Design a protein around this ligand. Structure first.
Ligand SMILES: [Cl-]
Ligand SMILES: [N+]
Ligand code: NA
Length: 461
């Protein structure tokens, strides 16, 4: 039986068909209670009071130490390493030799020769592969995300990681600290007081990400919850937590673009057969027999400004060949509310042969990687919708998408919701029929945009 991704792909037929029919099940945000009050009030609180996000369990952590730690990062990231020093974090974005996004995550520069990566599995795997096979003088400690279904088992992480966010977040933070606390610039790191402990901070309406050794997790949680009551702070569960990004604009789920190309053959031979890459799933209406049509490059998902050709890095030549002006662009799509009502109404039709794909709330994704076709009035595919749910703050279904560069803000397109042929074999997919949902191109981060009218609907020139 296959022991690595390369063997999995060789034995598994068409790669798209494999991923689109994977049996992995839901992409789960583990361990944290689904809800503490209810997801609607929890969503409301991060806009109107304050929240504690529990980020301890859904991300892979990679502790990177040694003389070559910074070089490893520089060699593999599009980001400029110039001027980088401890107590500044970056959004680490690696591309392949072909210029496609592998993944992304937050890399903390904790001290000289000491970094930590926090993010989904794929960029951590890529980092580990280059540390292990590239001769770097570095030491790596990998700490997996928590199990999707603990079923009563104990769960252990090396660190706990929280965020305090919302309009009253700083009031809570200064109450915990015991006095005024300087608001540093975005992604600069410092420390604060919590219950007599020195807690390191990352500046994220200002808020903070905080972290510490797993063993002090409840001591920190309890102090934050107690201090925050005065300002209406509440804890957010795992049901509401992942939908925040629908408002903030970050696409979590680019397909790791590592399935083709002989410059990636050795990486595929290194990746385990039960890796995210080998075992994950793709969900949605976009169908191509070519897995490369699911790849994205940094310019398409908002990382263009990160690309700096001031250092050597994997894929630099391919990125230099890209014309930024013509690339797809990240947008928020605002889904039509009548169409949403029609999706949900179909669940209560006892006579219809089929209903529309179930749209879970507040997060509607049903695979690791999401890929719904976005269409114009002529049926041209003009975009790919990549993360989907609902905001109780806006009273709107929303999706994050990358679409053709020339499409004006305010354009009404359609998102094809659901899968063909009654559904793929994914275990998250009930039998259903498809629906074209009207959706209005809006900014990212989302803001309400007036729908523009075009005679006969907007279509490509
Ligand atoms: Cl995530
Ligand atoms: N904000
Ligand atoms: Na950067």
């Amino acid at each position: 039986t296959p022991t690595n991704l390369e063997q999995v792909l060789a034995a598994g037929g068409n790669t798209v068909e494999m991923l689109r029919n994977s049996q992995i099940g839901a992409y789960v945000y583990p361990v944290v209670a689904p809800e503490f009050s209810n997801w609607r009030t929890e969503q409301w609180a991060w806009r109107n009071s304050a929240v504690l996000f529990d980020q301890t369990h859904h991300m892979v952590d990679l502790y990177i130490r040694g003389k070559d730690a910074l070089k490893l990062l520089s060699d593999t990231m599009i980001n400029s390493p110039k001027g980088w020093e401890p107590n500044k974090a970056k959004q680490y974005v690696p591309v392949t030799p072909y210029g496609h996004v592998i993944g992304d995550g937050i890399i903390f520069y904790l001290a000289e020769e000491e970094f930590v990566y926090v993010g989904r599995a794929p960029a951590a795997n890529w980092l580990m592969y280059h540390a292990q096979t590239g001769g770097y003088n570095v030491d790596i400690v990998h700490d997996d995300r928590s199990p999707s279904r603990p079923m009563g088992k104990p769960v252990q992480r090396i660190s706990w990681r929280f965020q305090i966010q919302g309009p009253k977040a700083w009031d809570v933070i200064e109450k915990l600290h015991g006095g005024t606390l300087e608001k540093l610039k975005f992604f600069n790191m410092a420390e604060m007081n919590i219950a007599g402990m020195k807690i390191r901070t990352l500046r994220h309406a200002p808020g903070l990400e905080i972290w510490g050794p797993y063993e002090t997790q409840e001591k920190a949680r309890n102090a934050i919850l107690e201090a925050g009551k005065e300002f209406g702070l509440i804890p957010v569960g795992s049901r509401a937590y992942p939908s925040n990004t629908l408002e903030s604009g970050w696409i979590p789920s680019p397909l790791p673009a590592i399935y083709t190309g002989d410059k990636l053959k050795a990486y595929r031979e290194w990746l385990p057969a039960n890796s995210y890459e080998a075992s994950g799933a793709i969900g949605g209406s976009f169908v191509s027999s070519n897995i490369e049509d699911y790849y994205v490059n940094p310019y398409e998902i908002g990382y263009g400004p990160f690309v700096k050709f001031d250092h050597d890095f994997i894929g630099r030549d391919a990125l230099e060949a890209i014309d930024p002006a013509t690339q797809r662009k990240k947008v928020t799509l605002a889904w039509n509310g009548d169409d949403m009502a029609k999706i949900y109404a179909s669940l209560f039709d006892t006579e219809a042969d089929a209903h529309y794909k179930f749209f879970d709330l507040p997060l509607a994704n049903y695979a690791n990687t999401n890929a719904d076709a976005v269409l114009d009035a002529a049926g041209n595919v003009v975009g790919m919708s990549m993360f989907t749910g609902y905001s109780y703050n806006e009273k709107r279904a929303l999706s994050l998408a990358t679409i053709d560069h020339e499409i004006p803000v305010g354009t009404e397109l359609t998102v094809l919701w659901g899968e063909e042929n009654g559904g793929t074999r994914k275990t998250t997919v009930e039998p259903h029929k498809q629906m074209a949902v009207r959706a209005v191109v809006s900014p990212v981060p989302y803001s309400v945009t007036a729908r523009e009218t075009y005679e006969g609907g907007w279509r490509k020139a």
